[PDB]
Amino acid sequence: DWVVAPISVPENGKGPFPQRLNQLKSNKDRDTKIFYSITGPGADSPPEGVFAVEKETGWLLLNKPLDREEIAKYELFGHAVSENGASVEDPMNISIIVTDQNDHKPKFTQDTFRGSVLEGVLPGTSVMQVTATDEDDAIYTYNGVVAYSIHSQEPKDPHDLMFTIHRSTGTISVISSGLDREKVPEYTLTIQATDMDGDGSTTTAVAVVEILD
Amino acid sequence: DWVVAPISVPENGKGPFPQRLNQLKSNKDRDTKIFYSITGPGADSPPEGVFAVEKETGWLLLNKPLDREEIAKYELFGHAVSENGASVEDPMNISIIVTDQNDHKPKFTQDTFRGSVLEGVLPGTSVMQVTATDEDDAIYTYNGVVAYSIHSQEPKDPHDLMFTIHRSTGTISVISSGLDREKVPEYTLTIQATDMDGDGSTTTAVAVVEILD
Ligand SMILES: [Ca+2]
Ligand SMILES: [Ca+2]
Ligand SMILES: [Ca+2]
Ligand SMILES: [Ca+2]
Ligand SMILES: [Ca+2]
Ligand SMILES: [Ca+2]
Ligand SMILES: [Ca+2]
Ligand SMILES: [Ca+2]
Ligand SMILES: [Ca+2]
Ligand SMILES: [Cl-]
Ligand SMILES: [Cl-]
Ligand SMILES: [Cl-]
Ligand SMILES: [Cl-]
């Protein structure tokens, strides 16, 4: 059968609302006045009233802004009933696909990550790994693709930039010589995660690196 | 049967999340390891993952802040399954009632209301009626109870306060003499609606009153 195609709607629309999405129609409206209605989650069950349909015109409406991270797909049914009260079509599946906007900053899995490394390891040695997640799409876009960096290191002793971070994996490594527990037994690294693979919003956290004997 | 009572949770909770709500338990856990799960809108169907249950402990969790004006009541089912894979209880109804916080300001049904009145009507004469709605509860609290007032009138001719408004019905009336079309053919009233029956947040709109001949 011919049916309404899935309707794609970006999250966070500015309106105005109610917003026309697509117009339902039964061709039995030639012979009879038709009253349209819709059912399903988002229409007549939780969350109720996100979508509506204009009874006589068959216009499907979105009544407010959508949030992909709450519900990314709605599955509704359109109905068509004659003025005398008989259903004149089998209910039609209607799908609404909510598409992404970059509206989440990255979120570190901890506020303070802790790791350790032996003084005197080779430059290039992995120390630890930090992680930030991002609720946004990372399949079709970079909205949810996190890039990692180190913002600063304290103390600046002996050299200011003792560590680096793999920009995609969040693994922190030693890139210099000169680790010495007796001189500096612990470093605090301000670490950052930025979405749009580096071009977007940035969140900050801390990694503390204990220098072992 | 003994069952879990409806669980009341105010909207807009500050957490931390996940938040323990109530602990499910089958007393067959004496004889057998039990795995708990929950189903329904808010758990395994849209909106998915608002609630969860700890598999072994039976703790029901709320995972994020709720919004009474989106969904005010959730109807879930708790399940109890033995480690060998048999259901050992009939699923239990679980209700979550989301209680109100005053988080909506009043909203006027129009930005500009228009009415008219004959010059020379008696003081006390009704002119028009304006309306603001408020999404918040108005049954148990004043969160959704709107009080109306007039903020100002332009021009201030002949007297500054020609009209009043019924603080609950939003009906505007003439309270002075001296309406005269040839002198002032139209007035603009800045009107306000405030929730908590006057004690709360205030929204503003305009009513324009044409003086008829
Ligand atoms: Ca969103
Ligand atoms: Ca929501
Ligand atoms: Ca998003
Ligand atoms: Ca993002
Ligand atoms: Ca030493
Ligand atoms: Ca709310
Ligand atoms: Ca509320
Ligand atoms: Ca309110
Ligand atoms: Ca005159
Ligand atoms: Cl209509
Ligand atoms: Cl998308
Ligand atoms: Cl558990
Ligand atoms: Cl309430």
For each of the domains in chain A, give its residue range(s) and CATH number, in order of start.
Answer: 3-101 (2.60.40.60), 102-213 (no CATH)
Of A41, A70, A74, nearest to B41 by CB-CB distance is A41
B47 CB within 8 Å of a chain A CB? yes
Contact A159, A200 (CB under 8 A): no
| A111 contact B CB<8A | no
The Cα B187–Cα B157 span in angstroms is 9
Q: Does B45 touch chain A (CB under 8 A)?
A: yes
Q: Which structure tokens are listed for A29?
A: 């409206």
CA geometry: angle at A126 spanning A124 and A132, to 5°?
125
Extract the tokens encoding A118: 């032996």
Instruction: Please state, in angstroms and as integers, the Cα–Cα distance from residue A92 to each residue in A72, A86, A95, following that order.
Output: 20, 16, 10
Ligand nearest to the CA of B67: 6
**CA B143 – CA A205 distance, rounded (Å):** 39
Burial A24-51 (b: 16+ CB within 10 A, else e): bebeeeeeeebebbbebbbbeebbeebb
A42-49 contacts: CB < 8 A, separation 24 or more? A42/A71, A42/A74, A42/A76, A42/A96, A42/B46, A43/A76, A45/B41, A46/B41, A46/B42, A46/B46, A46/B47, A46/B71, A46/B74, A47/A71, A47/B46, A47/B47, A47/B70, A47/B71, A48/B71
Task: Measure in Å the smallest separation between the Cα of B63 and chain A Cα atoms.
Answer: 12
Instruction: Please state the separation of Cα A95 from the chain's center in Å.
Output: 20
User: Helix and strand tally (H, E) in chain B?
Assistant: 0, 16
User: Is A155 in contact with A172 (CB distance < 8 Å)?
Assistant: no
Q: Does B42 touch chain A (CB under 8 A)?
A: yes
Tokens matching residue A185? 């037994």
Backbone angles phi, psi at A3, to 5 degrees: -140, 165
Chain B nearest C-alpha distance from A128 (Å): 27
Taking one residue from A and the other from B, the number of pairs with CB-CB distance under 8 angstroms is 21
Angle CA(B77)–CA(B22)–CA(B70) in degrees, nearest 5? 65
